[PDB]
Amino acid sequence: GSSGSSGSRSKQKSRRRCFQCQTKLELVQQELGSCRCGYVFCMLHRLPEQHDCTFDHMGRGSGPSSG
């Protein structure tokens, strides 16, 4: 038993592999899968909605939503 919340507690240890399924990402994937938030996923979890991405693609300004 090794307890003690110290150091850092992350999940993205090796971008090389997805951050959700930890699958192997080819040279191309690693680039494609990559995201803006700061995490790399596979061709299945590459999309933002897939990993409830925190980033906001809808930027470059703001406006009224309610209609």
Query: Which residue ranges make up the annotated binding site for Zn(2+)?
Result: 18, 21, 35, 37, 42, 45, 51, 53
Q: How many residues bind Zn ion (CB under 5 A)?
A: 10
Q: How many CA atoms lie within 13 A of 55 on its CB side?
A: 11
Counting other chains too, the contacts that 11-16 makes at CB distance below 8 Å and 24 or more residues apart are 12/38, 12/39, 12/40, 15/39, 15/40, 16/40
Instruction: Give the range of 1-9, 12-20, 24-32, 57-65 binding Zn ion by CB under 5 A.
Output: 12-20
Instruction: Give the range of 8-16, 24-32, 51-59 binding Zn ion by CB under 5 A.
Output: 51-59
| Structural contact between residues 36 and 46, judged by C-beta atoms closer than 8 angstroms | no
Q: What is the contact surface with Zn ion in residues (CB under 5 A)?
A: 18, 20-21, 35, 37, 41-42, 45, 48, 53
